[PDB]
Design a protein around this ligand. Sequence first.
Ligand SMILES: [Cu+2]
Length: 153
Amino acid sequence: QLQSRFVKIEDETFSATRLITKAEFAKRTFGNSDLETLKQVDAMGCDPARRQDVLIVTGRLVSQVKQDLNAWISLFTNRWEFISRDPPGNVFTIPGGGEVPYKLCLSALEPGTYHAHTQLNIASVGPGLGPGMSIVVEGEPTEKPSAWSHPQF
Ligand SMILES: [Cu+2]
């Protein structure tokens, strides 16, 4: 099993199983996928009714241990970008024996067929993965800014 015995990821729900890339959405909406236009898409935030590149994953983290734990959350299977997370901190607390609802909002960046899972990382313990779901992303690859750098010109 891929769940942690310490904290279970329960009631995982994915808002969609078919999306387009952030670039494909920019192209369709604005006519181009330049870095500047990708920033206009980013300005829309977590709005998958408007943005066809956005996935929402929701669920609840349920603790089976006696003490508070520290954790962070991500999406398992660069190709995806975070828009927002709840809880919001880089690390958050999961109370002992308690429950933390979560919401992850992501932009699909690159085309492909992904088997995606909520991934929990419990500090000092390790990972837990929720149930997967297959998500197909279509559309043009989203460009990233160059990693080249030089002294200011
Ligand atoms: Cu999978």
